[PDB]
Amino acid sequence: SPGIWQLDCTHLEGKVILVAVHVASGYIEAEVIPAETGQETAYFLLKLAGRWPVKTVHTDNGSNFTSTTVKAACWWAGIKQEDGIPYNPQSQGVIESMNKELKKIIGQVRDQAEHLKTAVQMAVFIHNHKRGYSAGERIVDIIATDI
Amino acid sequence: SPGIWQLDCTHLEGKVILVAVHVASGYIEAEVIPAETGQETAYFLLKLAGRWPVKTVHTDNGSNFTSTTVKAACWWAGIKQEDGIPYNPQSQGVIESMNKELKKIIGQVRDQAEHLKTAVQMAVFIHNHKRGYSAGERIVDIIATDI
Numbered sequence A, B: 001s002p003g004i005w006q007l008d009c010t011h012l013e014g015k016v017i018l019v020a021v022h023v024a025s026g027y028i029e030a031e032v033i034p035a036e037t038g039q040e041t042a043y044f045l046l047k048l049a050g051r052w053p054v055k056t057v058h059t060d061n062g063s064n065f066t067s068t069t070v071k072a073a074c075w076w077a078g079i080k081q082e083d084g085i086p087y088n089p090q091s092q093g094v095i096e097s098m099n100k101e102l103k104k105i106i107g108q109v110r111d112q113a114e115h116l117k118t119a120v121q122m123a124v125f126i127h128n129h130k131r132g133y134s135a136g137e138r139i140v141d142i143i144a145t146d147i
């Protein structure tokens, strides 16, 4: 579980927000892309795995699970690519609630920047710092304990 | 020192590679941009500070130190913006050696992707994983100990 991440795709302003959640901590990384493609998802995972010790990724949908480009990136980066079927039924709700919360924060910062990507990174900041520990503190502690 | 980062700008293929180094560990994050502007640097720092507990940034040059946009991002993200004058003379050499090493790795992966940004993220991955601890292990341990 220190190495388990979940992909999540949500939409705002006609754009796509791609999110990776570290399941055990709730820590997130996110980016804005014009549309979800295999190449964009692959590049996002490459970035993620260079920054955190990503062992397993639960993909957000069947297209990214199938994508040969995503599979290639996971091979390159030493990631076990898995499906994202909510075997635990709590998972749907948790991701739903995360997207709602993220969109709420984005709304609270949206008039502080021209570009959606800026607002999204502000929201990532606020989410990861929110406390009692923050998600950023939890991920570091979990991984440090594992090392 | 757990919160101290150094900015670094290097050039390849007519593009700019912007690098943030966590000084105590050698862990890096990096991105490719067409040129180093205040807005790009500001956005890069916002991303960084949402992902790690960035307390202090030593800026890479006087233009980024002066930039009101960079100062605004540092204000927003709770970062102390400082100059990057190598008071310790070993600092020049260490950054010089880091850029040379990064360019070497980029060369070793360059034919595995069309786009420079992909090669740069491959290089970030290799750098942070290289072992005896890796930079990625060191940064997590340093920060966890601090928390």
Ligand SMILES: COc1ccc(CNC(=O)c2cc3ccccc3cc2CN(C)Cc2cccc(OC)c2C(=O)O)cc1
Binding pocket: A111, A112, A113, A114, A115, A116, A118, A119, B038, B039, B040, B042, B043, B046, B069, B070, B072, B073, B076
């Ligand atoms: C991350 O560094 C900062 C630094 C300062 C601020 C404070 N906010 C403003 O100064 C502002 C507020 C606006 C509010 C409504 C409409 C337009 C706006 C345009 C602006 C000016 N721009 C240049 C900010 C900006 C900078 C760098 C990259 C950016 O995007 C890549 C953007 C952006 O605008 O997204 C936000 C973020």
Ligand SMILES: COc1ccc(CNC(=O)c2cc3ccccc3cc2CN(C)Cc2cccc(OC)c2C(=O)O)cc1
Binding pocket: A038, A039, A040, A042, A043, A046, A069, A070, A072, A073, A076, B111, B112, B113, B114, B115, B116, B118, B119
């Ligand atoms: C990170 O995910 C992967 C997945 C697979 C590979 C294996 N490499 C190739 O398949 C390849 C090698 C090339 C070698 C010389 C010239 C062109 C090339 C074009 C390609 C095909 N592209 C689509 C890879 C690619 C994918 C996603 C985003 C990308 O950039 C944003 C690029 C890119 O090309 O930069 C690398 C990285």
